[PDB]
Amino acid sequence: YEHSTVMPNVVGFPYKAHIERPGYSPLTLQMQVVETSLEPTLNLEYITCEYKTVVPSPYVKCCGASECSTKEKPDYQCKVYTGVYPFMWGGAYCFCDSENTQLSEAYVDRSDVCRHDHASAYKAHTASLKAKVRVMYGNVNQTVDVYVNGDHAVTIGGTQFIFGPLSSAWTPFDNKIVVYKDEVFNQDFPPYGSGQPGRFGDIQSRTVESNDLYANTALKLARPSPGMVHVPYTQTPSGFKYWLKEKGTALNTKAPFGCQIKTNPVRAMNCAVGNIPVSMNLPDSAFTRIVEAPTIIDLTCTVATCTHSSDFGGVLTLTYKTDKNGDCSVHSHSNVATLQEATAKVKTAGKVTLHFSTASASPSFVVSLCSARATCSASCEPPKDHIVPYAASHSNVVFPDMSGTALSWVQKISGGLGAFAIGAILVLVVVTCIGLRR
Amino acid sequence: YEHSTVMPNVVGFPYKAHIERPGYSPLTLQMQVVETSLEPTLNLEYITCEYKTVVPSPYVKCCGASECSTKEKPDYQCKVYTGVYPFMWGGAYCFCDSENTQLSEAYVDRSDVCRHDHASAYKAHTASLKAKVRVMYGNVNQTVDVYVNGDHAVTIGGTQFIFGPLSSAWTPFDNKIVVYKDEVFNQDFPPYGSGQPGRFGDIQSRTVESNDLYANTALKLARPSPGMVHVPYTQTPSGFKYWLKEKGTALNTKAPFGCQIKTNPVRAMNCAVGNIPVSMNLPDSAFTRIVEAPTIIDLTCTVATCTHSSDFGGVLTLTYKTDKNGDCSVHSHSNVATLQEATAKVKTAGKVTLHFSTASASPSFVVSLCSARATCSASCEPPKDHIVPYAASHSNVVFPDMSGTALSWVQKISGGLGAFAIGAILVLVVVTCIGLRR
Amino acid sequence: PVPVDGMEYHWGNNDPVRLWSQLTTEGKPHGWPHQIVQYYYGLYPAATVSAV
Amino acid sequence: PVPVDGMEYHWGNNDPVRLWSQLTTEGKPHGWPHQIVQYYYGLYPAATVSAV
Ligand SMILES: *[C@@H]1O[C@H](CO)[C@@H](O[C@@H]2O[C@H](CO)[C@@H](O[C@@H]3O[C@H](CO)[C@@H](O)[C@H](O)[C@@H]3O)[C@H](O)[C@H]2NC(C)=O)[C@H](O)[C@H]1NC(C)=O
Ligand SMILES: *[C@@H]1O[C@H](CO)[C@@H](O[C@@H]2O[C@H](CO)[C@@H](O[C@@H]3O[C@H](CO)[C@@H](O)[C@H](O)[C@@H]3O)[C@H](O)[C@H]2NC(C)=O)[C@H](O)[C@H]1NC(C)=O
Ligand SMILES: *[C@@H]1O[C@H](CO)[C@@H](O[C@@H]2O[C@H](CO)[C@@H](O[C@@H]3O[C@H](CO)[C@@H](O)[C@H](O)[C@@H]3O)[C@H](O)[C@H]2NC(C)=O)[C@H](O)[C@H]1NC(C)=O
Ligand SMILES: *[C@@H]1O[C@H](CO)[C@@H](O[C@@H]2O[C@H](CO)[C@@H](O[C@@H]3O[C@H](CO)[C@@H](O)[C@H](O)[C@@H]3O)[C@H](O)[C@H]2NC(C)=O)[C@H](O)[C@H]1NC(C)=O
Numbered sequence: 020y021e022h023s024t025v026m027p028n029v030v031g032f033p034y035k036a037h038i039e040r041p042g043y044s045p046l047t048l049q050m051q052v053v054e055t056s057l058e059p060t061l062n063l064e065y066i067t068c069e070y071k072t073v074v075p076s077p078y079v080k081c082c083g084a085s086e087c088s089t090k091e092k093p094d095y096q097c098k099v100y101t102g103v104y105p106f107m108w109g110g111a112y113c114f115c116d117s118e119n120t121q122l123s124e125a126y127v128d129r130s131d132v133c134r135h136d137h138a139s140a141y142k143a144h145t146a147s148l149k150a151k152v153r154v155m156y157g158n159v160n161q162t163v164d165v166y167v168n169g170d171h172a173v174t175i176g177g178t179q180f181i182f183g184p185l186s187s188a189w190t191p192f193d194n195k196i197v198v199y200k201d202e203v204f205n206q207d208f209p210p211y212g213s214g215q216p217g218r219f220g221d222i223q224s225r226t227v228e229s230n231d232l233y234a235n236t237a238l239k240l241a242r243p244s245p246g247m248v249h250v251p252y253t254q255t256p257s258g259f260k261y262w263l264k265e266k267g268t269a270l271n272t273k274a275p276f277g278c279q280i281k282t283n284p285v286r287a288m289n290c291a292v293g294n295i296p297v298s299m300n301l302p303d304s305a306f307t308r309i310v311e312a313p314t315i316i317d318l319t320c321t322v323a324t325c326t327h328s329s330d331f332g333g334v335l336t337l338t339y340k341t342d343k344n345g346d347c348s349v350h351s352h353s354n355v356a357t358l359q360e361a362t363a364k365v366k367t368a369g370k371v372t373l374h375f376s377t378a379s380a381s382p383s384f385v386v387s388l389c390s391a392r393a394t395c396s397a398s399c400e401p402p403k404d405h406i407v408p409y410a411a412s413h414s415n416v417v418f419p420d421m422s423g424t425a426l427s428w429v430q431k432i433s434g435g436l437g438a439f440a441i442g443a444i445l446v447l448v449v450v451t452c453i454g455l456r457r
Numbered sequence: 458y459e460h461s462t463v464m465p466n467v468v469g470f471p472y473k474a475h476i477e478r479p480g481y482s483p484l485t486l487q488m489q490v491v492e493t494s495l496e497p498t499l500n501l502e503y504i505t506c507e508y509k510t511v512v513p514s515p516y517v518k519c520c521g522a523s524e525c526s527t528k529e530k531p532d533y534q535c536k537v538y539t540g541v542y543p544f545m546w547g548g549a550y551c552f553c554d555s556e557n558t559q560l561s562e563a564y565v566d567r568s569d570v571c572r573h574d575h576a577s578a579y580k581a582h583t584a585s586l587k588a589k590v591r592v593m594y595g596n597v598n599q600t601v602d603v604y605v606n607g608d609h610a611v612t613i614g615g616t617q618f619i620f621g622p623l624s625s626a627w628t629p630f631d632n633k634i635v636v637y638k639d640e641v642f643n644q645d646f647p648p649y650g651s652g653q654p655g656r657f658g659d660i661q662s663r664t665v666e667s668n669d670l671y672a673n674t675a676l677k678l679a680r681p682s683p684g685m686v687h688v689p690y691t692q693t694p695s696g697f698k699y700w701l702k703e704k705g706t707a708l709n710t711k712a713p714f715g716c717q718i719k720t721n722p723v724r725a726m727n728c729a730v731g732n733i734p735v736s737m738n739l740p741d742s743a744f745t746r747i748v749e750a751p752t753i754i755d756l757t758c759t760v761a762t763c764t765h766s767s768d769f770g771g772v773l774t775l776t777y778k779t780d781k782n783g784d785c786s787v788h789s790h791s792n793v794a795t796l797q798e799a800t801a802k803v804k805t806a807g808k809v810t811l812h813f814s815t816a817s818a819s820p821s822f823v824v825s826l827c828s829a830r831a832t833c834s835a836s837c838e839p840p841k842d843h844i845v846p847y848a849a850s851h852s853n854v855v856f857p858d859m860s861g862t863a864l865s866w867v868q869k870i871s872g873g874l875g876a877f878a879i880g881a882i883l884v885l886v887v888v889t890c891i892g893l894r895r
Numbered sequence: 896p897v898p899v900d901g902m903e904y905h906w907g908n909n910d911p912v913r914l915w916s917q918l919t920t921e922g923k924p925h926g927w928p929h930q931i932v933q934y935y936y937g938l939y940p941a942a943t944v945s946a947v
Numbered sequence: 948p949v950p951v952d953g954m955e956y957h958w959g960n961n962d963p964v965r966l967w968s969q970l971t972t973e974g975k976p977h978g979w980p981h982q983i984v985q986y987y988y989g990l991y992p993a994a995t996v997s998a999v
Contacts, residue, residue, distance in 0.1 A: 060498060062585070064608075144583055147500070149932070170502075170648030180649075210608035210619075277903060278911075329917055378936070380924040398925050401934070406897060406916055415899075417918075424925050425935075713966075715955065767969055818976050818986075835976050839986075844949065845969050854952075855990075862977045863987075 020306075022299045028185070029291050031410060036297075037350040037387075039268040043306035044389060047348040047361040048156035050297070052226030055150045055167075057278075057287045059143040061191050065211050065223045067140070068133035069257045070234060076244075077250050078122040079105050085120045093222075093234040094128040096252075100242045109159065109396060111246075121243065124249050127222070127234045134227055138199040138259065140208045140220075143192040144286070148185055156361075157305065167295060178305065183296035191274045191287050199263075201282045203270045207225060210296050213259075219257030246437035267347075311344040313365055316390055319394030328402040331359050335395065337388055339369050347389040354414040355382045365390065378413040396422060458744075466487060466623065467729045469848065473799055475788045476739070482750035484743065485799040486594040486785045493588050493605075495716075496724040497630050501664065502651055506571035506579065507695045508660045508672065514769060515681075515688050516560040517543055519551030523558045524742060529674040530564040531660075534690075537561075544684045559681060561688050564659065565672045572665055576697065577636040578646045578658075579723075582876075586623055590731075595743055605733055617738040624731035629712045638692030639720050641708045652696070655725045686853040708793070745827075751783045751803060756829035762819070763837035767849040769797045770811045773833060775826060777807055790821035792852040794833075801826065816851040819861025834860060 026034045028054055038046045078085070087097045087151055103121045105113060109265035113119040118304045148167035153159070159176040192204040192428045197219075206219075214220035214235050222234040244444040271280045297373025318339045325333040333356070347365050351358050371388075464472040468490055476484040492703075514859040516523065525535045542549065551557055558768070568574075589602040597614045605620045631643045635657075642765075644657075650671050652658035660672040679689045709718045716728025738815045756777040763771040787801045796813040803826070857863055896902070900943045901915035905931040920937025948988070953967035974986030988995045 060500070060583075062498065107947055145498075172648055172650040172652070181648075210610055212612070213610040213617075271907070277901070327918060329915070378918065399923065401919055403919065404917060405919055406914055410901070410913075410915055411899075425931050428928060428931075448910055710957070713952070765970060767967065816970060838970050838976065840959070840969060840973070842969055843971055848953065848965075848967055849951075863983050866980050866983075871962055 020301050020303070022301065024297050024299070025198065026052075026246055026295045026297055027409075028055070028293050028295055030289050031085065032056070032412075033360070035350065036299075037348075037352075038301070040306050042309065044224070044309050044312035045350070045387070046156065046165065046306055048154065049361055052234065052295075053153055053154050055289055056145050056150065057190065059146045059190065059285060061141040061143055061196070061285060063206070063226065064140040064142060065220075065225055066133075066137050066224060067220055067259050069130050069198035070127050070222045071081050071130040072125065072127055072238070072252075074125050074250055074252070077248055078124075078246060079103065079119065081119050082115040083118065083120065085122050087122060090126075093123075093128065093232045094238055095126045096238050097122070097242050098242050103243065104246060105248045106246045107248075109353055112225065115331065115433075116162050117453055120139050120246075121254075122241075123240050124270045125238055125240060125245050125250070125252055126191070127236060127238060129222065129224065129232055136295050137227065138197060138262075141196040141198060141285075142194060143193070146190040146192070150182070150301065152182070153181070154215060171441040177302040179296040179300040185295060189292055191270065191276075191280075191290070192285075196285070198282060198285060199266075200258060201452035203285060204266060204268075205270060216255045216258065218258050219262040221255075222293065230333060237288040252420035263323065277394075278362055284451070294453075309345045309390070311345075312360055312389060313341050313343050313393035314325060314348065315341060315365070316392040317341050318388060320373075321391040322395065322397035325377065325382075325397040326377065326402055327377050327399045327413075329376070329407055329409060329413070331357075331374045331412060332402070333375045333377055333397060334372045335375060335386070337371045337373065337386070337393065339365075339371075339388070341365055341367060341393065349386065351386050353382050354395075355379055355416050356384045365389075378415055379417050379419050381419040381425075383420035383422060387421075396420060399422075406446045458739050458742075460739070461734065461825050463727070463732045463734050466493070466733055467492065467848075468727050469861035471795070471850070473788065473796065475614065475695045475786075475790075476737075476744075478744055480747065481824075482747050483786050483788070483790055486592065486737075487799055488593075489591045490733075490795040491589050492727060493586065494633070494724045494726050495586050495628060497584045497628065499723065500580045501632075502578045502580055502646070503658075503661045503663055504571075504575050504665050505661065505697050506575040507568050507697045508565050508674065509568045510563065510565055510674075510676070510690070510692060512688055512690065514562050515562075515686060517541070517551065517557065517686070518560065518859050519557040521558065522556075522886055523560050524600065525560070528835050531566070531670045532676055534673060534676045534678055535560070535562045537680050538680050540761040541681060542684060543681075543823045545686075548681040549684075558637040561678045561690075563674070563676055563678060563688070563690055565670075565674060567660065567662065567670060571662075571817055575665060576661060576700075579636055580632065581634050581723075582632065584628045584630070588620065590620075592618070612724050617743065619736045621734035621736065623733060627730055629708070629714070629716070629728075634681045634723070634859060636720060636723060641718050641720065641723060642704060642706075643708060653698065654693040655699065656696050657700040658717055659693075673742075675815045730867060737858060749783075751785070753777050753827045755756070756826060756831045758824055758833040760833060760835035762814070763835045764840050765818070765820075765837045765851070766840040767814070767816075767845050767847065767851070768840070769814045769850065771813045771815060771820075771835065771837065772825070773809065773811045775808075775809045775812055775824070775831070776874070777803075777826065777829065779803060779805060779807070781805075785827035787824070787826050789813065789822050789824045793817055793820050793854045794822045795851055796824075803824040803827075814851045816849070816853050817855055817857055819857040819863070821858035821860065822877055834858060836862070840891045 020040060022035050024037055034050045036048050085099060087099050100121045102117055103119045104111065145385060150167050151164045153161060153162040154175055161175050163173050165171055165173050165182050167182050167185055169183050173177050186243060195207050197204045197206045209215060210218050210232055211223050213224055216235055217236045221236050224232045228447060236255050241251045243249055243251060274280060276290055276292055279288045280289060318337065321336050323334045323336060324346060344366050347363050348361060349358065351364050356375045356377045365373050377399060380399050385392060385394050458478055459544065460476055461797060462474050472488045474486045519773060523537060525537050526534065538559045540555055541557050543858040559662045586605045588605045589600060592613055593602040599600055599613055601607055601611050601613060603611055603620050603621055607621045610617050610619045633645055635642045635644045637645060647658045649661055652661050652673050654673045654675050660671050674692050676690055676692050681687055691774060712718060712725065714727045714728040714730055718725050759774045761772040761774060782804050785801050785803050787796060787799060789796050801809050803809065815837065818837055820837065823830055823832050897914050897916045897917050901913055903911045903913045905911035918932055918938060922933025922937055925936040932947065948965050949968050951967055951968050951973060955965045956961045957963040972986055974989050975982040976986040990995030
């Protein structure tokens with residue numbers, strides 16, 4: 020038997036489904052979304068880590084001239100200085116008075132801890148959801164992992180379930196992403212090969228292991244002081260090290276809809292939005308003979324106490340007459356009220372009790388027990404506690420019923436004015452008919 | 458100095474760009490897209506391979522009974538038959554004549570070579586384009602490989618190039634793909650966990666090494682024939698094997714725009730669509746000062762022969778007068794004609810020749826040498842060869858110029874008709890003016 | 896502020912804590928008409944005036 | 948058929964080969980007006996008639 024339904028994507032919300040086979044007693048099955056996950060699809064752009072500067076020892080060559088040679092190294096700087104007259108601990112070497120020369124050389128390279136400590140830059144798109152749902156009905160109770168897209172069917176006790184594509188297509192990750200340890204940042208980084216000194220991306224490499232490297236940090240050499248051997252240089256501080264201090268904010272403390280962020284893999288969890296269609300295919304052993312199910316006649320509903328709080332704060336009593344004892348699959352056909360349980364043991368005493376939660380001062384809903392029906396309405400009073408730590412267990416609908424006190428009152432006033440207008444129109448019509456008949 | 462232009466995405470088309478700085482003689486750059494590759498992003502859904510059936514030896518419990526035990530194997534089947542009296546070569550054992558039991562057991566499993574012979578079911582989206590391009594100007598050759606999107610800048614001898622995003626977003630891959638060896642198919646595959654026997658996806662596994670499995674082949678065991686030991690079973694043939702011969706067509710021999718598919722990784726190479734915007738940043742070393750550039754005066758253009766064929770089939774003669782001998786940059790400022798060479802060796806004799814390709818009956822275009830300009834117009838006869846084995850080298854512009862023979866005739870006829878109409882209007886106006894002044 | 900949707904605060908190294916607000920107010924529903932306006936004023940104090 | 952875009956064929960076990968058509972016709976361009984129409988009718992014989 021095929022069936023379909025829709026289910027809100029709110030964690031812990033005990034959604035219920037009611038199925039009515041014409042030859043069989045109705046069934047109520049309970050579904051709940053224990054956990055979700057929103058995997059974005061990533062393609063690495065590059066990696067950034069703090070650089071390291073190597074300076075080889077100066078070549079101070081005496082009594083002659085020397086020439087510099089270019090090399091294929093990331094951000095290489097080499098220069099030749101004349102007239103140098105160095106000194107050492109014992110004395111001054113380079114016997115020639117002023118025909119000396121110094122070769123200063125310097126270049127940059129990725130630091131040795133870069134494999135352990137670095138920040139990645141991704142482009143994120145096309146999120147895919149996945150979830151785990153607990154289902155239960157009759158004597159079956161299971162927790163299953165399902166992809167929330169229209170092509171993963173999972174079997175639970177002979178029943179086939181398919182969870183359709185999500186209602187909306189909202190994702191928290193921007194087009195460009197920067198990941199560091201266990202935090203994700205909605206940022207935009209400079210293009211590879213065009214980094215700038217002093218900011219994020221002063222050095223860039225396509226992958227942690229890639230041999231090439233593009234570094235641009237303005238390494239500038241200056242001539243050494245008279246009588247010293249020290250190779251002085253000026254070179255802008257680390258861009259990655261600046262960014263680690265001035266990144267600002269995060270996503271873990273800024274994402275909407277109150278959904279956590281986690282890394283490895285990048286994912287956003289428990290992120291409540293939208294509706295999930297469900298398609299179901301059930302066997303014929305799940306239901307029961309209507310003959311074997313008890314029959315219910317003269318069904319009446321009375322509400323004892325109502326209080327629209329977040330917890331299950333209203334109590335119903337159903338009175339009836341039965342022929343044989345058994346189990347009934349109770350359900351409420353409206354979302355104004357949400358019931359607690361899905362089965363009741365019907366006994367010859369003809370008195371059963373149920374708990375529910377609502378959010379309107381005057382709710383009115385039709386509740387069904389096995390095959391019977393009843394229409395039940397209640398009056399509810401506000402709750403006192405201002406703040407509580409558990410989520411709402413009702414569907415959050417507030418519009419009152421037409422039979423409620425406020426709407427009955429407005430009905431009476433509108434009826435008075437309407438009858439007044441009708442009387443006025445009748446008087447005018449009679450008078451004008453007499454005038455025309457004259 | 459910055460600059461921007463657009464170039465067609467055709468492999469082997471010799472694009473020539475003109476740079477005209479106010480304080481220097483012009484440059485001409487040349488570009489050729491020697492190769493492209495359009496790689497989609499893939500998500501593995503499942504892997505299919507031919508199944509294999511395990512049939513354990515039967516258990517014959519004689520002078521007793523046995524009961525069926527259930528297990529958890531894919532498509533597991535187990536049954537018990539009663540009344541068997543099996544025979545062996547030495548004779549008939551199981552002395553008990555009638556009350557015997559035979560237990561039949563079977564299930565399915567992935568093949569031994571599923572690791573080397575399998576078909577992958579992918580889902581593809583959000584393609585990324587990669588290019589390899591030859592750039593040449595002044596005196597530098599070189600080919601670089603660039604990601605074609607606004608975020609990869611490559612430096613080619615002191616010049617920076619950025620290839621912006623592609624104009625059109627057409628990708629030959631549909632939303633679902635099946636990859637087998639070296640062929641790609643645009644196929645809709647069944648959802649995971651709902652494969653039907655006898656077609657593609659009769660057995661389904663999440664990844665080649667994952668231990669779980671989902672199988673539908675509908676094994677049915679049968680009562681063994683009297684006096685024998687065989688465990689007879691029946692099963693629908695292999696879905697993957699059937700798909701192998703009934704797959705039909707491919708994409709390799711079907712893709713539009715004439716680009717060839719390759720696998721590992723899956724990509725589509727060398728197909729023409731749209732334009733690549735390219736942005737440049739050149740240093741001052743590339744240009745030449747106008748005082749060094751020779752000055753060209755009184756430049757005029759003539760055509761010797763013109764045949765609008767795919768190859769370079771028109772010979773152009775430029776005559777001029779100069780003061781010193783040197784080199785100039787030659788360009789044609791219209792896409793109705795394309796020049797073969799970008800630099801010319803200018804002498805004092807006052808004659809140069811160039812080669813151009815066109816596709817219009819009466820081309821008209823403005824050609825420039827160093828700082829001068831002139832206009833060329835010609836008459837081109839169609840070629841004689843019906844078929845050529847090389848791609849066209851013109852921009853494929855057909856509409857003739859307005860001064861050509863055809864539009865000359867149109868202009869003459871329209872001028873005659875307009876003269877007649879204006880004369881009639883003047884006569885009528887004069888007559889009506891006389892009538893009004895009467 | 897803790898609107899009806901709720902909010903989480905994360906203090907030091909403790910786990911973040913989430914708090915939700917209930918639909919409470921100060922009027923009297925199911926009473927006199929001038930008290931019902933108070934009750935539906937406490938909730939949504941921006942469309943009640945317009946509707947009245 | 949081999950239009951002005953071109954086609955490739957794959958015969959047996961060789962490598963595929965490409966062929967491109969070329970702008971050829973049977974009229975005489977740059978002659979009389981009753982011949983230029985033939986020249987431009989050999990090419991694109993669906994808009995020339997409409998234009999004339
Ligand atoms: C021991 O000390 C003496 C110092 O006199 C060193 O003699 C030096 O030898 C070099 C050889 O290349 C001379 O350099 C040349 O000088 C000429 C003149 O300027 C110049 O044109 C060449 O291009 C080259 O630079 C240097 O002048 C000379 N010193 C003098 C003459 O005072 C000698 O090399 C030392 N022995 C060693 C280091 O083994
Ligand atoms: C359907 O089956 C699931 C599990 O298969 C049942 O989950 C059960 O949930 C209860 C409470 O939600 C767990 O009891 C808890 O035990 C801990 C032990 O320290 C205790 O601290 C808690 O206060 C609570 O008593 C129970 O272990 C868990 N069953 C498991 C894990 O097997 C679920 O209750 C079933 N549905 C129904 C309607 O019973
Ligand atoms: C050696 O051969 C003798 C030949 O009879 C086997 O005796 C047979 O044993 C089986 C198993 O105990 C008996 O089956 C029983 O039948 C009764 C109904 O009569 C039923 O109530 C029991 O539940 C059981 O199924 C069978 O009757 C008996 N043969 C005769 C003639 O009574 C003996 O088992 C063989 N031993 C070995 C080790 O093979
Ligand atoms: C820039 O570099 C490329 C590649 O280094 C140059 O293309 C090369 O040009 C030479 C001759 O111009 C080619 O050699 C000849 O090629 C023909 C092709 O049919 C072959 O049959 C001959 O036996 C001979 O090998 C060479 O193959 C060609 N290379 C490539 C990859 O096309 C290009 O000429 C350089 N730029 C300039 C302005 O020359």
